[PDB]
């Protein structure tokens, strides 16, 4: 979703799963068009990965698998 309109959508870092959360907190943290509470990324990895060529989720999946391979080696 972010690659389609980089200026008008907030990037998501990861989902939140916290059984200590209340209902208004669940409603307050669901941003970025997600289906639940999420965190908004400020690392800037979205812009970095977008600049270097990654476009789809399959690209990121191949990347993560390759890096798991690299760290195992």
């Amino acid at each position: 979703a972010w690659v389609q309109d980089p200026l008008h959508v907030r990037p998501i870092a990861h989902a939140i799963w916290d059984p200590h959360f209340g209902q208004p907190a669940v409603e307050a943290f669901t941003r970025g068009g997600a289906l639940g509470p999420v965190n908004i990324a400020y690392s800037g990895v979205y812009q970095w990965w977008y600049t270097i060529g990654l476009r789809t989720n399959e690209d990121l999946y191949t990347g993560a698998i390759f890096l798991l391979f690299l760290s195992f080696i």
Partner: protein, 31 residues
């Protein structure tokens, strides 16, 4: 079936319990 529903308790509750019990057991007695 929701994967967080399983891994966040196990890694947040079970894993530290097991690891800390084991590490206490290892650190606090003589060989």
């Amino acid at each position: 079936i929701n994967l967080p529903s399983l891994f966040v308790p196990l890694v947040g509750l079970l894993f530290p319990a097991v690891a800390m019990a084991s590490l206490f057991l290892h650190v606090e007695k003589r060989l």
